[PDB]
Each structure stands twice: as C-alpha cells, then as structure tokens.
Write a protein that binds this ligand. Structure first.
Ligand SMILES: CN[C@@H]1[C@H](O)[C@H](NC)[C@H]2O[C@@]3(O)C(=O)C[C@@H](C)O[C@H]3O[C@@H]2[C@H]1O
Lengths: 83, 203, 80, 141, 153, 136
RNA sequence: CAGCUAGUUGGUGGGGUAACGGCCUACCAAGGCAAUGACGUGUAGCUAUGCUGAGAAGUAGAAUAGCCACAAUGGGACUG
RNA sequence: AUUGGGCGUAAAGCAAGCGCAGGCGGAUUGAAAAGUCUGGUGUUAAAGGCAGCUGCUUAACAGUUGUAUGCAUUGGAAAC
RNA sequence: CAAGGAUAGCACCGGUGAUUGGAGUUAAGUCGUAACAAGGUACCCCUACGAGAACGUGGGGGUGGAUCA
C-alpha cells in the first residue's frame, strides 16, 4: 500500500497550545500580469505525532493527513536541523 | 446590383467595357464623358487615393456582375491559401462559371451566361447547375444538356468569338474543358489590383 | 441525434448508461454515418475491446453493425 | 599600466558596462574601465569575439582587493565607432526568460543580442543552433 | 517627377495698417526610383508658391537605397516629438500607410512596408521624422565593413 | 512608472459616463428597485410643449418637449421635422441623440410612433421623419 | 470598510456521519485571522468560449456542453 | 503605457527629515538546484479558434485528420 | 434541538418631504473698474478683520515684476 501526499517546506513561527505549532511557509512565484516573482507567506497549524518536538525558529517539511480540524491539515514530518 | 439592366452608363462613366468595345455604336453622340448632367468640364470633387481605389474596385467588380458582400466572402476564402494573392484574386474570380463560359465562346456576356445557367440550360458532372457561384476545379468538364442545345445565340456565337489560351473546347459537341489557371498577361486588363487588395479593410 | 437537420450524426462513443446524450463519457470509439450506408463504419477495433471489458455495453442499435464488422466474434471469447 | 583616481562599481555589471559604452560612443572615448567580475569578463569576451570591440584587458595590483577591467572600441580613420545603438532589456527590477522559439533578433539579424543559458553568454545564432533559449540581457547594433 | 500636394494652408503676418494673407504649400519630390526630397514655400498666389516649392525640393534632392523592395530592418525615427515606426513587409502582402505616409513611401520607390505613427500627428514634423528615419538606414555592407565578419549574420 | 508601485497600485481604467443614462435605467412594480438594461429606445409621455432660445452662433425657434418616463428620471427632448403633431399629453418614442443648441437636451422624439405622425412629404429622408413612399 | 470572532481555537472521553474531523456532547485550556486588506459593504452563476485586437489583453459569459444553486417562502424528516 | 507615457514653465516631485516592514544591492569559491533553460510521462473533455481533406449543384454547413497555451512527477545545465 | 410568533430597542442602507444654499446654461442687463501695461496703490501665495459687490488692509513669503540692468 503506497502512501503519498503533498509535502511543503516552511519555517515554524509560533506555538502556544499543547503539542501543536504554527508554521510560516514562503513562496516566491511569478506575478500573473507582470511576471515579477513576488513572495507570499502563509500560516499553517500542525500537530506533533510523537517522534518530533516543535521548537520555534526552525525549518520543517510537512505532509498531508486526515483533517484534524480547521487549519490542522498537516503534521510536522521532517526537521532539517541547523548546521 | 446583380442584374443592373443598364451597363452603358457605367461604361461611359468608367471609360471601360466588359467586351473589347461595343458600348459605343454611334446611336447619337459618341461621348466618353460621364453620363447624366454634371457639366462636361467637371471631373470630381475629391481625387485622393481613396477615390481611385474605390473607382478601380467598382471597375473590377462591375466587370464581373458580382455583389460586394460575395466579393468580401471570396476575399475571406482567398486569405485561406497564400502565395501571390494579387493575381490569385483574378485567377479565382475568373474560375466562376460564366467567366469560363465566355472564355469558351459560348455567350458574349456574363449576364447572358447567367441567364442561360439559371434557367437550367447547362449540365456539369451529371448535375443540373443553376448558379455561376461554383469554384471550378482543374480537370472538370461541362456539358450542354443537349435538349437545350437548340439555343440560337450560343450556336451563332460559338464560332464568332475568341477562345482563351487556358481553356479548350470541342465546340462541335459544344463541350469545353478547363486546362489550367488564367494569367495576367494573356487576358485584357490594366487594373491596379494592389488597390483592390489594400482597399478592403474588413480583414 | 447530433450534427445537421436531415443529415443526422451519432458518434460511436464509449459511455456508461447514466446520463443524457452529448455529455460526460470515457472514450471516443468512432462514428457511423446513416446518411450513406454501404457496410462501413469508423471503428478503432482495439479500444472498443477495453470499453466492452469494463461493462457499459454499447447502445443496442449497433449490435448488428458490430457483428458485420466482426467485434462480437472476438468479444464472446471471454465466455467461451 | 597605471590608473589613479579610483573608480567605483556603478551598481552591477550589465547596466554599468552599457552606460559606459553609450557615454563613450557619445564622447568618442577610446579607453573605458570598470570593476572586474566574471559576468563582465564574459560580456567583454563575447563583444570582442563578435567584432564590435577593440582590445580588452583584465588586471589586478596584487590580489582581488583591486581588480579591474578595461577596454577600447573599434573605430575608423573617419571618426566613426563600429557600434551605433544599444538598449538593455534585462533590468535589476525585471528579468525575462524566454524559450527557444521566443528568441529575439535585432535589426533583422544584423544586430547581436547576448543570451546566457547555462554556459556563460553567447550570440543568438549559436544559441539557435543549439536550440537553447534562456534569457537575453541586451541588444547592441 | 510626380509633385503631389500634401497640405496647403492659409498664413498671414500682421502688420500696422493691414495683414498680408498668403498661401503656404508643402511638397515632396520623388522619381519613384531613388531621388527623393521635400520642401516648403509661401507666396501670394498658387504659381509662385508652387515654383518655389519645386525649386527648394529639387535643390535638397538626395538618393535612397532599396533592400529587396523593402526596409529590411526596423526603424523608429524621431523629429519634433513625432515617432514613426517602420518595419519590413513581406512581399505579397501589399503596402499600407496613411495619406502623407502613403505619398512619402510610394514616392520613394518602395514596394511595401508596415508603418505606425506615435504622438500627435503633424504633417511637416511627420515628414521630417520619416525622412530622418529613412536616411538613417543601415546596410549589410556597412555592418560588414565595421565588423570583423563579412557575412550578414 | 516602476514595477513595484504597479504591484501595490495596479492601474485602473477610466470610462466616460454614457450620454444617456436615463435610457439605461428602469423601474418595476411589486417593489422599488432600480436596474440597468441599457435600452436603445424607450417610451415617454410629453407634459410640456414650447420653445427655447439657442446659444451664441445661431438664433432660431425650435420645438422642445419635456417628457416623463415610466422609469425614475424625466428629461427633455428636441422635436425634429417641419411642423409637429405635439400639443400636450401624448405617448411617444424617445431615442438617444444629441442637439448642440440647448443645454442638456440629448434626446430625440423619433416620429412615426404610436401617436405622433410625420412630415408627410420628406422623400429624401424617410427612414427618419416617418413618411410613406415617394408619391406614385 | 481597523480590528473580526465566539463552537470561535485546542487536548481528553463518548455519540454520530457512508467514512475523517467541535460534526454534536462532558470536562479542561485560550487563541485563530489580519495593513501582504480580515471583516463589513456593493455587484455577480462559474468554465470551455462568442466578439475585437497581431499580441500582450479588453469585453460579455445567448445558444451548446460540465459543475453547483433553488423548485410559492422557511423549516424538518420518512423512502430507497 | 510590462508590451507601449510622464512629473522645470501645460495636470503631476509630498514642506522637510528619522526610520519599522517591503523592494533592490560590492568581488571570489563551493554545494544543491528555490525559478529559469531543457527532455520523457500523465493531465488541459466534447463541441468551438486555426490548417488539410470529404458530401451536400456550390458557397453557407456538417464530419473527419491534427494542432493549441497550463499543471505535476521524473533526468540533465549550473550562467543568472 | 427546534422553524415560527410576540414584545422591546440597538446597527446599517434607501425612497419621499414645506424651504432655503451654491453651480451651470442663456446675443454689448445695472453697479463699479477688480485684474491684463509700472492696469495708474507693482503683482501673486498663506492666514486674520471689515464692507453692497468688485475686494482694501495687517503679518510673513516669492518674482511667474516695470526702469536703473
Ligand atoms: C506717420 N507717418 C506714417 C509712417 O510714415 C508709416 N511708416 C512708418 C506709414 O506707413 C504706410 O506707408 C503703410 O505702409 C500703410 C499705411 C497704413 O500707413 C502708411 O502711411 C504711414 C504714415 O502715415
């Protein structure tokens, strides 16, 4: 049973609740009219499965899952630690 | 107008004729000035490029007895294929049935040929033809529906005419065949076709 | 029918018996012209097998035409 | 070789070299110098191998702490520069990247545009020969 | 050798005890084979102004080159803030232009060309800009001699 | 301008107000609601018939009519044609247009309508100024 | 149109949906979204496309086709 | 007015300044390749635009043969 | 749970409505000459007072002012 989903890489920003974080992703994409690569940033709420621990100010890669609730539609899958 | 019923006025105003010259037979004064009454010293009020373009457009159109909207339709179909469209317009215009009918020596005028064709006096590809708006293809014949071969006008004018070099006919059986495309230097014409090409801005 | 009045048309089209004419479908098997019938029909002869192998049997009015073409003989091989 | 009155990098390679070229052909100046960089070296290389430019040199004092390039312009005894016109298409605020069949040509093929795809800058005809499109940077003629 | 009018105007200087009304005529001369020029004149009546304009235009005659019966490279000519944009026309398409530009291009012996006008149209300024742009024309031999390569590309 | 200010402030097109917004607005019963249909002609009722003086470069005695409409706005119009058949209280057809002699009159009472007859004679112009064919 | 929001936000247990989920419930906890334009207001069926323009684009989204919407107005539920 | 406009006297450079965010940026080398360039694959329905062909006396038309931007995966290129 | 009613007053947008404000449109209306020249007190800009009006003046600023330049 192959298990695949969309994956997005972003930077975690905040955490106030229990084992849940809010991550800011950035995307530089062409403007629809002038073809200027504008940066848009967006917030996503994620939860910790148990093999991870959310610390603010880190790059993460998240995948889809069953919708936990509103805005919680991804989980922190892989962390790339600072080098 | 598709059937003007008066061509001498156009000939006098334009100084041209569908035939070589037969629209001045001294039935009174033989004057090459404009018809009507506008003074024999006046020519026109506006003589720009628009005026001469329109004049040549009317000359070319009324030399064939065609309406303007069908001319625009023909130009639209001409834009499909490409090449030297200046002479291609002439080649396609001459491919109309009545044009080749005159080129066959069948009837002196396109109007007479149209009158013959519409009333069901022509056979082509075993199908009755009632309109000259047929895009002739290379390698097609035309019969005469021998019941109507008894028309005095065509019988008399078969020999007394001129046969174009790009068409052939066995006039003894009164059937002709399209040989090849017409040429500019073989037919009598002095029309500035470039004016015709440039004038129509619908496309 | 589709096409032109007094000149009908019906494409041989792969579809399941759920919706109306000229709508959602799966594949375009071919076309038949009833305006001139001389035992000839636009048929791919390959995709129709896939269409038949996934249910959704064609319109009932084409069975004789497919038998004339020779599709039933190779289709009934499964039940052999 | 000696040049006092120290020079300053304008903002970037392409704009600096192009404005220097335009001002030189307006003032008929032989030698024009600017700050050294890989991109400017490539631009000078292509513009001198395309037969629009005179001698070009790259020099340093002892290290890359002071490294500059300089170049002359092709001329004629009748006081006429070989080049006639120039216009930059790529700007620091906007860079347009185009496919193969969207490759522009100047004059009608007379001018040469400078296109870099993955191996430095090159002429339009060679890029079309290798069927690689990419980004243009300037039109010269 | 054609000498067609372009735009005739009424002008008048104002002076104590009466103003002097006169006619101003703009002309363009072209053999249709390469010698082209243009001129202005003013006079009390038609014949003197026409003769003056013909003489002035004939004096300023200069030649022009033909590239396959077309203008083989783009040109944006400017004079008095009136841009004229000329680009090659492939043979078999005809020649398109506006009245003054029509006369200018046909008088220079040019088969066809695609033209456009930017800015407020003005006859004399437009004629000046068009002639400046046409006389700016380049040539493959020019680029060959100013380059190292001796070919078109 | 520059790219960035285009990004933050995209340019917006400008449109000229139509020369007859009254011919485009309509009302209805069962409710009060103004809607736009951009009609090319409407129906009206004349409430005043008289004359008014034109501006500087011409002086004459024209026929102008105040006309109310089934919709909200009510406006003026100019009566063309030799003579007239408009006394008061008549239903007629209003069409877009403009007359350059009076302030704000940009409407034409097209003759040959439900009530007004035309300049029975004008054979040169018979599409307008509704009249029969040229006399046999 | 400067702040909107309270099942709104999240953990736990149960219920329930055709399944996953404040979808509902009991306790506990207090953020989410926003100046990169939420929220409020005005207008609007969307899409392939029709038309114009060489094009970037502008305009309207009639036939025709796909989707959702509603069936005098508003609530519910049975049936399969 | 990205294509394709301006701001001295015609409309238009804020009264001037400090600056948050944003946008834009000195040279050399490395790494991947975030876009870009460039292949394969699957997806952009039908009808419709465009090109050829065919039957409608014939054009109008209809059918057919192809074409059409964009998206995602996958391998190359590392000049920007 | 619960459409719906009833009461009560809070928000938002519209129609209408005596009667007055200002603007535009009208062929040398009356008032006075304000401005255009050194326009007969140089002009203009900001602000304050006052008078039928045109504006006059106070304070600050400029020449898009004439002579001398
Ligand atoms: C006061 N003498 C004047 C003075 O000589 C003028 N020239 C400067 C002179 O000018 C004229 O000769 C003219 O040219 C025209 C006429 C209006 O006044 C004429 O008479 C004008 C004379 O009356």
């Amino acid at each position: 049973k192959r298990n695949q989903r969309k994956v997005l890489i972003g930077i975690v920003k905040s955490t106030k609740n229990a084992k849940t974080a809010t991550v800011q992703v950035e995307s530089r994409f062409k403007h629809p009219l002038y073809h200027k690569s504008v940066v848009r940033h967006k917030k996503y709420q994620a939860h910790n499965e148990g093999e991870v621990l959310a610390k603010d100010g880190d790059k993460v890669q998240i995948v889809e899952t069953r919708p936990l609730s509103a805005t919680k539609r991804f989980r922190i899958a892989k962390i790339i630690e600072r080098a | 107008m598709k059937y003007t019923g008066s061509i001498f006025k156009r000939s006098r105003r334009l100084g041209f004729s569908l035939l070589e010259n037969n629209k001045e037979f001294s039935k009174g004064k033989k004057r090459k000035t404009i018809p009507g009454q506008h003074g024999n010293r006046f020519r026109s009020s506006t003589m720009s490029g628009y005026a001469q373009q329109l004049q040549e457009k009317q000359r070319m159109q009324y030399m064939y007895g065609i309406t303007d909207k069908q001319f625009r339709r023909l130009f639209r179909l001409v834009l499909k294929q490409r090449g030297n469209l200046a002479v291609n317009l002439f080649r396609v215009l001459e491919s109309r049935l009545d044009n080749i009918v005159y080129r066959m020596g069948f009837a002196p005028t396109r109007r007479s040929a149209r009158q013959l064709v519409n009333h069901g006096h022509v056979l082509l590809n075993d199908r009755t033809v009632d309109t000259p708006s047929i895009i002739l293809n290379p390698g097609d014949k035309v019969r005469l529906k021998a019941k109507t071969i008894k028309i005095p006008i065509v019988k008399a004018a078969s020999e007394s005419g001129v046969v174009s070099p790009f068409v052939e006919t066995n006039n003894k059986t009164f059937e002709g065949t399209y040989v090849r495309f017409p040429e500019r230097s073989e037919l009598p014409a002095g029309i500035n076709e470039s004016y015709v090409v440039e004038w129509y801005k619908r496309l | 029918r589709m096409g032109r009045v007094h000149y009908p048309t019906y494409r041989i089209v792969a579809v399941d018996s759920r919706v109306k004419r000229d709508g959602k479908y799966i594949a375009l098997i071919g076309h038949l012209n009833p305006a001139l019938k001389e035992n000839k029909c636009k048929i791919d002869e390959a995709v129709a097998l896939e269409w038949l192998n996934k249910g959704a049997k064609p319109t009932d009015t084409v069975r004789s035409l497919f038998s004339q073409t020779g599709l039933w003989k190779k289709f009934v091989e499964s039940k052999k | 070789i000696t040049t006092t009155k120290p020079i300053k990098a304008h903002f970037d390679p392409v704009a600096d070299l192009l404005t220097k070229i335009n001002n030189a052909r307006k003032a008929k100046l032989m030698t024009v110098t600017t700050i050294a960089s890989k991109l400017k070296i490539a631009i000078l290389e292509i513009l001198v191998k395309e037969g629009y430019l005179a001698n070009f040199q790259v020099l340093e004092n002892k290290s890359k702490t002071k490294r500059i390039v300089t170049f002359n312009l092709k001329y004629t005894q009748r006081r006429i520069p070989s080049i006639n016109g120039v216009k930059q298409i790529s700007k620091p605020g906007l860079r347009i990247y185009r496919p193969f069949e969207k490759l522009p040509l100047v004059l009608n093929g007379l001018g040469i545009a400078i296109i870099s795809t993955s191996d430095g800058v090159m002429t339009d005809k060679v890029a079309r020969l290798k069927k690689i499109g990419g980004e243009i940077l300037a039109y010269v003629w | 050798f054609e000498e067609r009018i372009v735009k005739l105007k009424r002008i008048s200087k104002t002076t104590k005890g009466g103003r002097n009304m006169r006619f101003s005529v703009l002309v363009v001369v072209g053999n249709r084979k390469g010698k082209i020029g243009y001129g202005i004149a003013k006079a009390l009546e038609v014949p003197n102004a026409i003769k003056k304009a013909i003489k002035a235009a004939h004096n300023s005659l200069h030649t022009i080159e033909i590239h396959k019966g077309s203008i083989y490279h783009e040109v944006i000519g400017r004079s008095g803030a009136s841009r004229v944009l000329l680009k090659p026309a492939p043979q078999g398409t005809g020649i398109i232009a506006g009245g003054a530009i029509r006369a200018i291009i046909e008088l220079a012996g040019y088969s066809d060309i695609y033209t456009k006008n930017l800015g407020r149209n003005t006859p004399i300024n437009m004629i000046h800009a068009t002639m400046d742009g046409i006389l700016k024309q380049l040539s493959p031999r020019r680029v060959a001699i100013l380059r190292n390569k001796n070919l078109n590309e | 301008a520059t790219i960035a200010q285009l990004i933050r402030k995209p340019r917006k097109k400008k449109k000229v107000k139509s020369k007859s917004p009254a011919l485009h607005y309509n009302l209805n019963l069962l409710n009060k609601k103004v809607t736009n249909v951009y009609s090319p002609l409407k129906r009206g009722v004349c409430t005043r018939v008289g004359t008014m003086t034109p501006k500087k470069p011409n002086s004459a005695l024209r026929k102008y009519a105040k006309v109310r409409l089934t919709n909200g706005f009510e406006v003026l119009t100019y009566i063309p044609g030799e003579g007239h058949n408009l006394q008061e209280h008549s239903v007629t057809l209003l069409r877009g247009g403009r007359v350059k002699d009076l302030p704000g009159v940009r409407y034409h009472i097209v003759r040959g309508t439900l009530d007004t007859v035309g300049v029975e004679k004008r054979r040169q112009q018979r599409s307008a100024y509704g009249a029969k064919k040229p006399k046999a």
